[PDB]
Design a protein around this ligand. Structure first.
Ligand SMILES: CNC(=O)c1nc(NS(=O)(=O)c2cc(Br)cc(Cl)c2O)cn1C1CCCC1
Length: 301
């Protein structure tokens, strides 16, 4: 079992935090908030680095380019913005969605951005020009998550409509639909690209072989019936699953046995987002508006 212990609490956001993400080079943590701001923090000591501003309404998600030089943010103002992290300047505003943008990601190559929106569509965008390349009629309800696989050739999307879908990046064609149908609040590809991890608002995480349409594992015991809470694979030490929870705790499961191996206590509101450091056994966690803080935790395995 891991032994994550609190090392830093990071205050500064003035509304609920929505997303935390470590930069791929391990140096930074980015946070987004309903307060319309992105904040950059040192990944190792939690020292505040800078505030990035420009969105007109709150932000649901942020994501890093693979070279850690760009961020993209998804906002209720119906746009995404591409930011140069070093200068804090908005490089591009991605316009096209007709309602709130809820989720976003770069592909590994980082020449594309994928977004999902309340408008039920998935859009694929050219990073260099900011132009929308494809609009996928992906779902019949808000899109809660979008993620590229390890080589960028596939996209997975989830939605409140109860579906997960796998898309061919180049053609935009839907290659697979996984379908009771509780709302899907989060999905991402596994590190080895063969599985997807999906959160449903039945307080359950499920590890699916999407090619076979078989559910290999389920992770339960946490509380998730309302919010789109990020889940993570922890790949630096022991193989874990990490998720926030609506009972204010961080949950950590053994990937193989599905046993809860740790619960991290300290937040005073829903833990809406967690993130796992790329090389060290470090977790970042973030909570809603009774709390508004980010916590950094460290384990020996
Ligand atoms: C000894 N290996 C396994 O037990 C195993 N690895 C995977 N691959 S994975 O999900 O992508 C993955 C997850 C984590 Br957390 C870290 C890494 Cl590095 C990684 O590759 C799946 N499993 C089993 C088979 C179904 C569930 C457990």
């Amino acid at each position: 079992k891991p032994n994550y212990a609190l090392k830093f609490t990071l205050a500064g956001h003035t509304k609920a935090v929505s997303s935390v993400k470590f930069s791929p080079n391990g140096e930074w943590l980015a946070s987004s908030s309903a307060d319309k701001l992105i904040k950059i923090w040192g990944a190792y000591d939690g020292k505040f680095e800078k505030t990035i501003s420009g969105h007109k309404l709150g932000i649901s998600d942020v994501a890093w380019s693979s070279d850690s030089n760009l961020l993209v943010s998804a906002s209720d103002d119906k746009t995404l913005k591409i930011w140069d992290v070093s200068s804090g300047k908005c490089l591009k505003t991605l316009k096209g969605h007709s309602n709130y943008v809820f989720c976003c990601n770069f592909n590994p190559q980082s020449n594309l951005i994928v977004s999902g929106s309340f408008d039920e569509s998935v859009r694929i965008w050219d990073v260099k020009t900011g132009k929308c390349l494809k609009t996928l009629p992906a779902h019949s309800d808000p899109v809660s998550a979008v993620h590229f696989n390890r080589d960028g050739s596939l996209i997975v999307s989830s939605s409140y409509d109860g579906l997960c879908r796998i898309w061919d990046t180049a053609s935009g064609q839907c290659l697979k639909t996984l379908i009771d149908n509780p709302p899907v609040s989060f999905v991402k590809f596994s590190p080895n690209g063969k599985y997807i991890l999906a959160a449903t608002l039945d307080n359950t995480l499920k590890l699916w072989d999407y090619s076979k349409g078989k559910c290999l594992k389920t992770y339960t015991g946490h509380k998730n019936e309302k919010y789109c809470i990020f889940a993570n694979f922890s790949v630096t030490g022991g193989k874990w699953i990490v998720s926030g929870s609506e009972d204010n705790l961080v949950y950590i499961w053994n990937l193989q046995t599905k046993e809860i191996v740790q619960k991290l206590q300290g937040h005073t509101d829903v833990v809406i987002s967690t993130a796992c450091h790329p090389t060290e056994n470090i977790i970042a966690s973030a909570a809603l508006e009774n709390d508004k803080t980010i916590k950094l935790w460290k384990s020996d395995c």
